[model samples]
Target: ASHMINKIFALPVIEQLTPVLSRRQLDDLDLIVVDHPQVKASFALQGAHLLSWKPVGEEEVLWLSNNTPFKTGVALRGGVPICWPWFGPAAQQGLPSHGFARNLPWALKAHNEDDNGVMLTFELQSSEATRKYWPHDFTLLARFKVGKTCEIELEAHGEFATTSALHSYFNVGDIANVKVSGLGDRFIDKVNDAKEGVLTDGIQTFPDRTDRVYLNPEACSVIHDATLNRTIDVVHHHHLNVVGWNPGPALSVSMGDMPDDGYKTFVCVETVYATAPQQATEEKPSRLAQTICVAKR
Candidate 1:
């Protein structure tokens, strides 16, 4: 516990509920934002848990999911998770890889108190078994901004059509040593051992075995965490695709709750899965934003 996850602002008085509905019930119960004691933020639209970097002594750069979506969230080093709705593993018939809003519990409408910073608005509208196995009709907004550059944003407002991934869990310290610079060549390594094998353009190098799903990407990507020597500058906007993972040993003998050194600490620079070549029909209304801010020198 490197200590720092205590940012409370739960007010509900002034004749019942006022602080703008108590900060909209603290962003619909997904609050844990520390403005600036060195930077610390938490969001839970169930999948907006952006815990930025800047930690070495205790080592917990970022990795969250104390319990949700039936557990399968491990980010101890390569922590860049933004894997939404469904990105991998699914033929439908018991789907549950990264779907169901991390386990369900998000609804906070409006909460924007001002003078400096405090903006929390969340939602997950669309029921009837969530469109019977991922249909569309949503508005998931999570914006937590605090002074001195401590911002968190993950807005995914309905209808963008299939294929999604923001599974960002980046903490790069020791994942067979680190080195991931702007994926230049081209990718298609669908989870280690190349699923279909046949797409060798390059700009990726790790300890072998991977799960590639890279398409339309280039805003800013560079994570060379030479075992915590530090050098992470990833500033992406309007992300299109990027899902590279490393879960050697066959997902650790076939997923055992993951986390036994969690395969030598994480590495899943995800944010890809743009409807796989064909998938987009939203009529009118689409928004999917991602932002993770943190700078330490």
Candidate 2:
């Protein structure tokens, strides 16, 4: 499947970037697949979304759903979904959930290849369309560094307070056997009407329909996948909250884009601004970063 994608976006050796079509949606999207000896990666243009990545001699590091919808105006079901301006439900009625950053196109601002790996930067600036919902002038920048570790940075320029998150869906051998560690004590379980926060020491396991917004998480978290016998390290910078979620059986089956058993394949351990909003100013813009790397246990 990955090689098939390579054929459609074929480019001359001189060119590193090319445009391709989304098979299901049949929409034009940019494709960047680099094999620079040091690293390999594939990214899509829409929302500047990353489709997959891995270092040499390793299995796939990013897990995109097999049933992901690739149409325009619809966010893909998997990969790293960006939720900006607001994380979940809109503050006001009639607004799109998770903000417009993911649905809209982001311009490719820069691209570079080095001995280490390839780096790509995307930029989305405020426009007339954005002002309708956000009513603020700002610039949102996303940079991805593909190497031994996948590093992602999101920076915002403007004077505003907003909630956001990198809705990351990680592929595990099996959901039931995975364990995540490093979040501190206390979290708000959204499944329980968010009545009050719950207390915890640090470890987490997925038994069933799990949805919790962890508060003031540690700088680094780890996902122990027993099936894969590997640990995925999730390191964050300038982000405080972590959202662990699984739609579980009933909800996963109800989702049109999800397979009935999709809940067993992946888990969402998002880096977020849930408990409070992040602030950005003209003088000092706010930036958030997360680096994902895997190691054998």
Candidate 3:
């Protein structure tokens, strides 16, 4: 009923999945630790942000910074951070970039552990703080299905239009050895003064500072990690743009949360619904979902 969605509903088949799913503390943040039979993961209650996800016997799927300090209001350096109601720079300068969703706490509304895997639902509703930057009465739910193949879904409820992204930072073996496919040849290069560019080749590489919003990208994309000898598939549902970014050695050094050579181990390939926005109503809410799987190269 309040901004926190404090009162969870009584479900017909609700299972706490205790022991497998428990709460742990990291700094001032509360984290949901999932130690499923098939996988292991952690998500902070703040932002419903995924902190780490690694399937049994596999390397970590998400990249988290070594320098990240888990302060209450500060966002963790990596993992999956939700950019809701807005993306990138805030409507007005001085506001939090990528919206306040990542900095604010979310309520864990429901959870279930079945033979298939474990699922958790987290909710965030509009509040005085949210209305300050966004004047909409809205409800947002982030659902995570954890297993060997992970799934994330975002459901937005309201009669409003918005732009958002599940900004996922992926861990990789090496930066130069990475390439992403399925991003349609055209893109809005943010680093090149927001100019439109074409990829003569259909794949993306990180030879220099990279930041582009891939336009009309297919619903599915693949990240080829040569160093790790693995391939990751990123499949999305009802997503508009697929964004790719990697700070080269130059920008990586300037970041307080990243090591000088941090660029070598991670990249952000995001599923974003913006620049071709999503509009929702009381009757029909907007949903954006992504599924990821890792495989041998």
Candidate 4:
């Protein structure tokens, strides 16, 4: 009932200067997500986001934030970067950008496999600092598996609860030939220099500053990058909220290693954001997953 594909995937132990795109006969990048919780200001997925690979190369395509809101760190990709702003301005407002879960050193909670797929479950609990800062009893669970397709699932369980999303930095061959489908008609842009609320629909292409928060998305869409001749199929499940971000020249100047011309190479399709926490069930908590399947047709 599934595709006849088999590949072994694993995450590295420490942060590196670059990602391992290919190896002896395989690709190195597998999974990357924060380990612990962050406040909001400073958040970087140090070793989490740019997964399946190795050391940094000529230029870094993402921004690693090291501010107060976040402690561990934050990662920003050039094409489609993941922005986790779980904590906003001020500590009481919330936890931090992307929450503390991503920065924590996850433990191998469980591992299982069957004929269909091989599943790896990694987990982490809130620390003493996390409990004091956010003041919630929480458990963050991340699931990685390889089947006919590569899949990821993020589940957060807590009494008080919070908001989250998996930020994706997609490598669209060329920005000039890329168009994002599935979002239009309704969106709220949240970014510096942007109108308080901007609404749009009908094929949204970016050549400017865009920070759109889409509420409760219906059905997933595709990131069509004609230049790459590849289509990435996105599937969204129970989670709610989606964020789109493209930092312009100004933000790029602030980040030293980020390639100034790399903006046009990627786009982020997030499953978690601060806006639509309501769609997430508090009692049951919230979970976000991104299952990517590539086709050349």
Which lDDT tens digits does candidate 4 get at residues 1-297?
Answer: 000011212333344312221111112222332221110011123323333211112012222321112123333332122222263333456444555555555555665555544455666677787677666666666676544455667776765545566666565666666677776456666765434443454355667766777664545757777776776666666556666666656765565545555465666666654654423345676667777555563
**TM-scores of the models, in the given order?**
0.30, 0.89, 0.92, 0.67
Clash count of each predicted structure: 23, 0, 0, 57
lDDT for predicted candidate 1 compared with the true structure: 0.50
lDDT of 3 by residue, 1-297 (tens): 011111111112123448578776655777777877788787889989987788877788888777666788887778899998788888786887777888989999999887656899999999987787678898999999989888999999999988899998888898888999988888999998999998866689988899999887878789999888898888878898999999999898999977677788888889998796788997699998888999998
Q: lDDT of model 1 at residue 119?
A: 55
Error of model 3, residue 123, in angstroms: 0.4
Off by over 4 Å in 2: 1-15, 18-28, 197-199
Candidate 2 collision pairs: none
lDDT of 1 at 89: 64
Which 10-residue window of candidate 1 scores lowest in summed lDDT?
Answer: 67-76
Winner by lDDT between candidate 4 and candidate 1? 1
lDDT of each: 0.50, 0.77, 0.83, 0.49
- Over 256-296, each residue of candidate 1 has an lDDT whose tens digit, in order, gives 55544455555666656464522333544334454444444
Candidate closest to the true structure, highest TM-score: 3
* Candidates ranked, most accurate by lDDT first: 3, 2, 1, 4
Worst 10 residues of 2 by lDDT: 18-27
lDDT of 2 by residue, 1-297 (tens): 243334433543434253321212224555556666766666656767776776776666666766666677677676687888889988788877777788877887887777778788889898998887678999999999988889999999999998888888777888999888997778888888885575576788888898898886788889989887788888888887988888889988888877788888778888888687898997688887889988998
Instruction: Return the TM-score for candidate 4, rounded to 2 decimals.
Output: 0.67
